[PDB]
Protein backbone atom coordinates (compact mmCIF):
# COMPACT_ATOMS: atom_id res chain seq x y z
CA UNK A 1 0.00 0.00 0.00
CA UNK A 2 1.22 3.47 -0.87
CA UNK A 3 0.54 4.63 2.69
CA UNK A 4 3.47 2.57 3.93
CA UNK A 5 5.92 4.20 1.48
CA UNK A 6 7.92 7.38 2.18
CA UNK A 7 6.54 10.58 0.68
CA UNK A 8 9.84 11.32 -1.06
CA UNK A 9 9.97 7.93 -2.78
CA UNK A 10 6.37 8.36 -3.95
CA UNK A 11 7.12 11.83 -5.33
CA UNK A 12 10.20 10.54 -7.17
CA UNK A 13 8.40 7.52 -8.67
CA UNK A 14 4.89 8.71 -9.61
CA UNK A 15 4.50 11.56 -12.13
CA UNK A 16 2.83 14.62 -10.59
CA UNK A 17 2.59 13.05 -7.16
CA UNK A 18 4.60 16.07 -6.05
CA UNK A 19 1.67 18.27 -7.14
CA UNK A 20 -0.77 16.06 -5.25
CA UNK A 21 1.32 16.35 -2.06
CA UNK A 22 1.48 20.14 -2.53
CA UNK A 23 -2.34 20.19 -2.74
CA UNK A 24 -2.46 18.46 0.64
CA UNK A 25 0.37 20.55 2.12
CA UNK A 26 2.45 17.43 2.83
CA UNK A 27 6.20 18.05 3.05
CA UNK A 28 7.68 15.46 0.70
CA UNK A 29 10.89 17.49 0.37
CA UNK A 30 12.50 18.04 3.79
CA UNK A 31 10.02 15.62 5.40
CA UNK A 32 10.25 13.03 2.63
CA UNK A 33 11.35 10.21 4.92
CA UNK A 34 7.96 10.12 6.63
CA UNK A 35 5.42 7.63 5.34
CA UNK A 36 2.27 8.79 3.59
CA UNK A 37 0.34 7.10 6.41
CA UNK A 38 1.97 9.29 9.06
CA UNK A 39 1.67 12.49 7.00
CA UNK A 40 -1.99 11.85 6.21
CA UNK A 41 -2.79 11.01 9.84
CA UNK A 42 -1.26 14.26 11.11
CA UNK A 43 -3.43 16.24 8.67
CA UNK A 44 -6.58 14.15 9.27
CA UNK A 45 -6.86 13.13 5.61
CA UNK A 46 -8.62 10.09 4.14
CA UNK A 47 -5.52 8.14 3.14
CA UNK A 48 -7.53 5.73 0.95
CA UNK A 49 -8.59 8.64 -1.27
CA UNK A 50 -4.95 9.69 -1.60
CA UNK A 51 -3.95 6.14 -2.47
CA UNK A 52 -6.55 6.11 -5.26
CA UNK A 53 -5.31 9.44 -6.63
CA UNK A 54 -1.74 8.13 -6.57
CA UNK A 55 -2.83 4.91 -8.28
CA UNK A 56 -4.28 6.94 -11.15
CA UNK A 57 -1.08 8.97 -11.45
CA UNK A 58 1.01 5.78 -11.34
CA UNK A 59 -0.60 4.44 -14.51
CA UNK A 60 2.43 6.03 -16.21
CA UNK A 61 6.09 5.84 -15.15
CA UNK A 62 7.79 9.05 -14.14
CA UNK A 63 9.18 10.67 -17.29
CA UNK A 64 12.68 11.05 -15.82
CA UNK A 65 13.66 8.87 -12.88
CA UNK A 66 16.55 10.46 -10.99
CA UNK A 67 16.70 7.88 -8.20
CA UNK A 68 19.38 5.83 -9.98
CA UNK A 69 20.95 8.53 -12.16
CA UNK A 70 24.67 9.36 -11.81
CA UNK A 71 25.33 11.81 -8.99
CA UNK A 72 27.26 14.17 -11.30
CA UNK A 73 24.26 14.34 -13.65
CA UNK A 74 21.94 15.08 -10.71
CA UNK A 75 24.26 17.89 -9.59
CA UNK A 76 24.47 19.47 -13.07
CA UNK A 77 20.69 19.24 -13.40
CA UNK A 78 20.11 20.88 -10.02
CA UNK A 79 22.38 23.79 -10.93
CA UNK A 80 20.71 24.59 -14.24
CA UNK A 81 17.10 23.58 -13.53
CA UNK A 82 16.88 24.89 -9.94
CA UNK A 83 19.81 27.06 -8.79
CA UNK A 84 19.96 29.22 -11.92
CA UNK A 85 16.17 29.56 -11.97
CA UNK A 86 15.84 30.52 -8.29
CA UNK A 87 18.49 33.20 -8.82
CA UNK A 88 16.29 34.70 -11.57
CA UNK A 89 12.86 34.03 -9.99
CA UNK A 90 13.40 35.45 -6.55
CA UNK A 91 14.65 38.95 -7.47
CA UNK A 92 11.65 39.25 -9.80
CA UNK A 93 9.20 38.20 -7.06
CA UNK A 94 10.81 40.56 -4.56
CA UNK A 95 10.13 43.49 -6.88
CA UNK A 96 6.57 42.34 -7.68
CA UNK A 97 5.75 41.89 -4.00
CA UNK A 98 7.15 45.37 -3.25
CA UNK A 99 4.82 46.82 -5.86
CA UNK A 100 1.79 44.89 -4.61
CA UNK A 101 2.38 45.79 -0.99
CA UNK A 102 2.52 49.48 -1.88
CA UNK A 103 -0.24 49.67 -4.50
CA UNK A 104 -2.68 47.58 -2.45
CA UNK A 105 -1.55 48.75 0.99
CA UNK A 106 -5.06 49.94 1.87
CA UNK A 107 -6.68 46.61 0.96
CA UNK A 108 -7.40 44.00 3.65
CA UNK A 109 -6.08 40.98 1.75
CA UNK A 110 -2.73 42.59 0.86
CA UNK A 111 0.13 40.18 1.81
CA UNK A 112 1.95 42.45 4.26
CA UNK A 113 5.44 41.17 4.98
CA UNK A 114 5.72 39.15 1.76
CA UNK A 115 8.66 41.19 0.45
CA UNK A 116 10.45 40.68 3.75
CA UNK A 117 10.02 36.91 3.67
CA UNK A 118 10.97 36.60 0.01
CA UNK A 119 14.08 38.69 0.71
CA UNK A 120 15.07 36.43 3.62
CA UNK A 121 14.55 33.34 1.48
CA UNK A 122 16.62 34.89 -1.33
CA UNK A 123 19.52 35.76 1.00
CA UNK A 124 19.54 32.38 2.74
CA UNK A 125 19.12 30.38 -0.46
CA UNK A 126 21.77 32.40 -2.33
CA UNK A 127 24.45 31.74 0.29
CA UNK A 128 23.35 28.12 0.59
CA UNK A 129 23.44 27.43 -3.15
CA UNK A 130 26.93 28.96 -3.36
CA UNK A 131 28.16 26.59 -0.64
CA UNK A 132 26.67 23.63 -2.49
CA UNK A 133 28.23 24.72 -5.79
CA UNK A 134 31.63 25.59 -4.28
CA UNK A 135 32.05 23.01 -1.50
CA UNK A 136 29.62 20.13 -1.30
CA UNK A 137 28.88 19.38 -4.96
CA UNK A 138 32.60 19.29 -5.95
CA UNK A 139 33.27 17.01 -2.98
CA UNK A 140 30.58 14.65 -4.25
CA UNK A 141 31.90 14.80 -7.83
CA UNK A 142 35.35 13.94 -6.48
CA UNK A 143 34.03 10.75 -4.84
CA UNK A 144 34.33 11.94 -1.23
CA UNK A 145 30.58 11.85 -0.59
CA UNK A 146 30.98 9.12 2.04
CA UNK A 147 32.93 11.72 4.09
CA UNK A 148 30.23 14.43 3.79
CA UNK A 149 28.00 13.74 6.81
CA UNK A 150 28.86 17.09 8.40
CA UNK A 151 28.43 19.27 5.30
CA UNK A 152 25.21 17.46 4.34
CA UNK A 153 23.76 17.91 7.84
CA UNK A 154 24.46 21.66 7.54
CA UNK A 155 22.74 21.80 4.16
CA UNK A 156 19.75 19.83 5.46
CA UNK A 157 19.38 22.25 8.39
CA UNK A 158 19.13 25.12 5.89
CA UNK A 159 16.51 23.14 3.97
CA UNK A 160 14.38 23.04 7.13
CA UNK A 161 14.75 26.81 7.57
CA UNK A 162 13.79 27.37 3.92
CA UNK A 163 10.74 25.21 4.52
CA UNK A 164 9.80 27.37 7.52
CA UNK A 165 10.01 30.44 5.27
CA UNK A 166 7.82 28.75 2.66
CA UNK A 167 5.16 28.19 5.34
CA UNK A 168 5.23 31.86 6.29
CA UNK A 169 4.99 32.88 2.62
CA UNK A 170 2.04 30.54 2.10
CA UNK A 171 0.28 31.82 5.20
CA UNK A 172 0.84 35.49 4.30
CA UNK A 173 -0.75 34.86 0.87
CA UNK A 174 -3.77 32.75 2.02
CA UNK A 175 -2.00 29.65 0.66
CA UNK A 176 -0.97 31.58 -2.47
CA UNK A 177 -4.61 32.32 -3.30
CA UNK A 178 -5.34 35.86 -4.50
CA UNK A 179 -8.51 37.66 -3.43
CA UNK A 180 -11.29 38.46 -5.92
CA UNK A 181 -10.19 42.10 -6.30
CA UNK A 182 -6.69 40.98 -7.34
CA UNK A 183 -5.47 42.77 -10.44
CA UNK A 184 -3.17 41.10 -12.98
CA UNK A 185 0.12 41.99 -11.26
CA UNK A 186 -1.07 40.46 -7.98
CA UNK A 187 -2.33 37.30 -9.67
CA UNK A 188 0.81 36.94 -11.79
CA UNK A 189 3.01 37.28 -8.72
CA UNK A 190 1.11 34.49 -6.96
CA UNK A 191 1.58 32.23 -10.00
CA UNK A 192 5.31 32.98 -9.73
CA UNK A 193 5.24 32.17 -6.02
CA UNK A 194 3.56 28.83 -6.68
CA UNK A 195 6.16 28.12 -9.35
CA UNK A 196 8.94 28.97 -6.90
CA UNK A 197 7.43 26.74 -4.19
CA UNK A 198 6.91 23.85 -6.62
CA UNK A 199 10.50 24.14 -7.88
CA UNK A 200 12.10 24.59 -4.47
CA UNK A 201 10.27 21.60 -3.06
CA UNK A 202 11.28 19.37 -5.99
CA UNK A 203 14.82 20.73 -5.69
CA UNK A 204 15.12 20.01 -1.96
CA UNK A 205 13.45 16.65 -2.49
CA UNK A 206 16.05 15.67 -5.08
CA UNK A 207 18.83 16.60 -2.67
CA UNK A 208 17.39 15.18 0.58
CA UNK A 209 15.91 12.04 -0.96
CA UNK A 210 18.40 11.12 -3.71
CA UNK A 211 21.67 13.08 -3.93
CA UNK A 212 22.63 13.33 -0.26
CA UNK A 213 21.78 9.76 0.88
CA UNK A 214 23.41 8.15 -2.16
CA UNK A 215 26.50 10.33 -1.76
CA UNK A 216 26.79 9.25 1.88
CA UNK A 217 26.31 5.62 0.81
CA UNK A 218 29.42 5.93 -1.38
CA UNK A 219 27.78 6.03 -4.82
CL1 LIG B 1 3.85 16.62 6.16
MN1 LIG C 1 20.59 23.07 -4.12
MN1 LIG D 1 20.23 22.58 -0.93
O1 LIG E 1 19.46 24.43 -2.38
Author numbering: 2 to 220
Question: What does the paper behind this entry write?
Answer:
Our previous studies indicated that mutation of E159 to leucine in YtfE affects the formation of the iron center. The mutated protein no longer exhibits the EPR signal associated with the di-iron center, and the structure contains only one iron atom in the metal site (see below). The E159L mutation induces instability in the overall structure as judged by the higher atomic displacement parameter values when compared to the wild type YtfE. Moreover, the iron is weakly bound as deduced from iron release kinetics data. Substitution of E159 by leucine caused the side chain of H129 to change its position towards the protein surface, thus impairing the coordination of the second iron atom. This might suggest that the movement of the H129 side chain is concomitant with the release of iron from the di-iron center through the hydrophilic channel. The presence of a di-manganese center improved the overall quality of the crystals with the diffraction data measured at 1.9 Å resolution. Still, in this structure, designated as YtfE-159LMn, coordination and ligand distances were maintained. Data showed that the wild type protein has a higher affinity to the two metals than the YtfE-E159L mutant. When compared to the wild type, the iron release rate of YtfE-E159L is approximately 7-fold higher and that of YtfE-E125L is ca. 8-fold lower.
